[PDB]
Symmetry: C3
Subunit: 104 residues, 3 copies
Amino acid sequence: ANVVVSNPRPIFTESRSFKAVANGKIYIGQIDTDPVNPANQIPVYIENEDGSHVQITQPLIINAAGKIVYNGQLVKIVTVQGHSMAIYDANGSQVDYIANVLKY
Amino acid sequence: ANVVVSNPRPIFTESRSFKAVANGKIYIGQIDTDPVNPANQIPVYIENEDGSHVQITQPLIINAAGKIVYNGQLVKIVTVQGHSMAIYDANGSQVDYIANVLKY
Amino acid sequence: ANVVVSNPRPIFTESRSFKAVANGKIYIGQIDTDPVNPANQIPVYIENEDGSHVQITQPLIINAAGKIVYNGQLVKIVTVQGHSMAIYDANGSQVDYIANVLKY
């Protein structure tokens, strides 16, 4: 028994309070660059249960639950390489920034 | 310093609202099948601090904090192989379903 | 596409209710010992974005969002080896205890 049961879906909450980042926005981009700038964004893909990938546009939307959603349904998002990640709340206020996901 | 401190205990919350799947139920089963059906379920074990494993019955119960619990105490659950996972709230409504935890 | 976007910062919540362990404390110690006892604690370091590590004193503080904070800012904590971890709420009541993070 090596496979531990847990929750695989990521949840994004505030950094100064216990609240989901409801209607927030996540920008994915080049390692150590501001992903909010369109020129720094990288391709993001939805990985279907099928195993296929459908590239979508940014930013990614975080629903009321703090989970990324596309077309009203929870999705798994993946990129080809490491990336920087900036999370903004519904009011365009920056919640968090991870320069290099791969190093964190 | 390569060991980063984190929270190893999984937490299960609702998919459309920021709440715990309080008193919900988790079914673990064959990859890509409906775990709710007893014919698709696979063994689930509590992994004790001891390293020992004690097989328990399904479904797994989620307490009010959104954590799996057994005998009134937080427990770590493991399976031998990959599995599909379906989460239901206290009212029998499906919260989420991951057909293959390994791929996710 | 193998890099999945997720939330990398750990969040600490209560075990009997869906709340953040606001202003709680985390003790890191020798595997299978009470980390609250200083004799059992191991060194803990903040890993800065820079890649540098600065040792800090224990216990680690959890803010209102249930996130580890130091000097008022969210930090990434790392240690040298596996460890036991005890989490306590603002009232000194124990919330959780993981004897060996490496096994869990």
